[PDB]
Amino acid sequence: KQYIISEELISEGKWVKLEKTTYMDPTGKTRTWESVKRTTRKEQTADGVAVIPVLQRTLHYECIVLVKQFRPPMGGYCIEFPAGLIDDGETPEAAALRELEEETGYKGDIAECSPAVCMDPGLSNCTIHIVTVTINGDDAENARPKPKPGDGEFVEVISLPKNDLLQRLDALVAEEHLTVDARVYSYALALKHA
Amino acid sequence: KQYIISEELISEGKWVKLEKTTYMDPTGKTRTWESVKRTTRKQTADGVAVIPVLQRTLHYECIVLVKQFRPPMGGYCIEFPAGLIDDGETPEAAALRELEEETGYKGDIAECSPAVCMDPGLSNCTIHIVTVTINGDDAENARPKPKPGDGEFVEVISLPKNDLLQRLDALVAEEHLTVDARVYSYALALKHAN
Ligand SMILES: Cc1ccc(C(N)=O)c(F)c1
Ligand SMILES: [Cl-]
Ligand SMILES: [Mg+2]
Ligand SMILES: [Mg+2]
Ligand SMILES: [Mg+2]
Ligand SMILES: [Mg+2]
């Protein structure tokens, strides 16, 4: 029933733009919405990837590998899955493995790749693939992992046990001013609920 | 180590604004970022998202989701019930209210997250994730009455919690919909648990 009638550019930066979206509502009336988009999306099936990195080691509980970084939009530090935008011509899987290595040092193995999922669909058109990757932490390549951060990238790695993820995130949030990402929290809550 | 120095307004709509954030990188070098913010925040967070656990005896437990046209996305999305927190409303109260408006169901609060970020590389948007159980055997949830506000047109989709990820993948394959990243993350963790 509903569809886009027009998309008017309001303001365009280097990385983000704002649009006035006109669409048809299901009564058959014309309405508008204010829409955010990135300027960087070419033929990628999504803007970015987020990586769910399951660190697996003999005689260890499985860990979920997370990253903590300063996020200028938030004005502070956030804890997130490793993530980055997909380069032009790059597959979501390659992007995931690459970002995981750049941000954490680990070399993962693909497990699964989601369809493109929406980040905040009432506000933006931004999408990611969620890429599950296992990390064989007994491999020598993954012994002493060092991030290879790009220019202006400054990332801390936090590995937390899957079997206590929600409580461990709560204990990090109780100790310092930081925000947990909604996808991480959702993942941690389902682990509890399961 | 890192912090915001200044925020320059680039463009302000009714609902959303774009800013250029200047911040101090950890090397001592000043950098800029293009940031999105809502103009509606007063509150602990911008919004709530509700994880509604529909419990009916002799039935599988279901997660209650909503399908709506999202103008920024140009199409239909499958999401947790959700909306912005009214000025002077608690996140819990927003959760039960939005759940009723969007689904007709009357639930009970199970737990409430701290404010968590939606897309912190792009925006300052935050929500509380509120877990709510719904006694589907109670008379008030027999014929749930969804009360759409002006310009909301919401379909309710209840999926079994135990097969959530496969059921969502199926909707994406058949119905050309976009699943929300938080919903997808929750679904992944249900499978990844134990
Ligand atoms: C309730 C509401 C309605 C429209 C918008 C919009 N972005 O145009 C919003 F962010 C919130
Ligand atoms: Cl529950
Ligand atoms: Mg990143
Ligand atoms: Mg990166
Ligand atoms: Mg809503
Ligand atoms: Mg609503």
Locate the domains of chain A by residue range.
Answer: 1-194
CB within 8 Å of A22: residues ≥ 6 apart = A4, A5, A6, A7, A8, A30, A31, A32
Query: In a 3-state reduction of DSSP, which class is residue A51?
Result: strand
**Residue B40 in contact with residue B17, Cβ under 8 Å?**
no
Q: Which residues pair with B50 in a beta bridge?
A: B130
Nearest residue to B107 via CA among B164, B53, B56: B53
**Residue B3 in contact with residue A71, Cβ under 8 Å?**
no
DSSP B48-62: EEEEEEEE-TTS--E
Residue B96, classified by CB atoms within 10 Å of its CB into exposed (0-12), middle (13-18) or buried (19+), is buried
State how far residue B82 is from chain A, nearest Cα, in angstroms: 10
Query: In a 3-state reduction of DSSP, which class is residue A115?
Result: coil
Indicate the CATH number for domain B1-194: 3.90.79.10
Atom of ligand 1 nearest to the CA of B38: 10
**Residue A107 in contact with residue A135, Cβ under 8 Å?**
yes
Q: What's this structure's resolution in Å? A: 1.5
Q: Suggest the residue from A74, A163, A164 to mutate for an interface test with chain B (most B CBs closer than 10 A).
A: A74
How many whole angstroms separate alpha carbon A57 and alpha carbon B186?
24
**Separation of CA A113 and ligand 6 centre (Å):** 31
How many whole angstroms separate alpha carbon A178 and alpha carbon A128?
23
CB atoms within 10 A of CB A102: 16
Dihedral of alpha carbons B167, B168, B172, B177, sign: positive
Q: Compare all CA atoms of chain A with the CA of B17 and give the residue at the minimum distance.
A: A18
Task: Decide the pairing of beta strands B30-38 and B126-135.
Answer: unpaired
Asked if A4 reaches chain B (Cβ–Cβ under 8 Å), the answer is yes
Residue B75 tokens read as: 């199409």
Nearest residue to A95 via CA among A108, A86, A104, A103: A86
CA distances from B114 to A103, B45, B47 (A): 26, 9, 12
Residue A82 tokens read as: 């490793």
Atom of ligand 1 nearest to the CA of A34: 8
- DSSP E strands: which ranges in B25-164? 30-38, 47-55, 62-70, 75-79, 82-84, 108-112, 116-117, 126-135, 155-160
CB atoms within 10 A of CB A156: 14
Across the interface, whether the CB atoms of B178 and A72 are under 8 A apart is answered no
